[PDB]
């Protein structure tokens, strides 16, 4: 797999499959605007959850196998909502 790097506001580097990152139209635009992206506004505790979502979504879309709940801790819910809105995820 080709990979891309997503960097949080606090400098954590999340390395994910390219195919996974292009689920986000915003990220696709940011990468074709390179294989690294910096997010000045998304801290690592939020961006880490975003990457788990990519894995979760790709695994369970068009699956007959029963789907489990995507968990979101309350403490991060608010910031994750804002990130999802920006990333259109």
């Amino acid at each position: 797999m080709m990979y891309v790097k997503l960097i949080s506001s606090d400098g954590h580097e999340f390395i994910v499959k390219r195919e996974h990152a292009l689920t986000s139209g915003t990220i696709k635009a940011m990468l074709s605007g390179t294989n690294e992206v910096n997010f000045r506004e998304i801290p690592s505790h939020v961006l880490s959850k975003v990457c788990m979502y990519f894995t979760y979504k790709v695994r369970y879309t068009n699956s007959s196998t029963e789907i489990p709940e995507f968990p979101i801790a309350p403490e991060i819910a608010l910031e994750l909502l804002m990130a999802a809105n920006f990333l259109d995820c």
């Binding site: 789907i67 709940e69 309350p74 819910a77 608010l78 994750l80 809105n85 259109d88």
Partner: peptide, 29 residues
């Protein structure tokens, strides 16, 4: 079955579950 909710809709669900609708306007968003 559950759908694969968008990350946005899933966040919206969790926030609605935690915040009385009178208080939505008070959130910093």
């Amino acid at each position: 079955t559950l759908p694969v909710y968008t990350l946005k809709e899933r966040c919206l669900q969790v926030v609605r579950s935690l915040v009385k609708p009178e208080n939505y306007r008070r959130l910093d968003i």
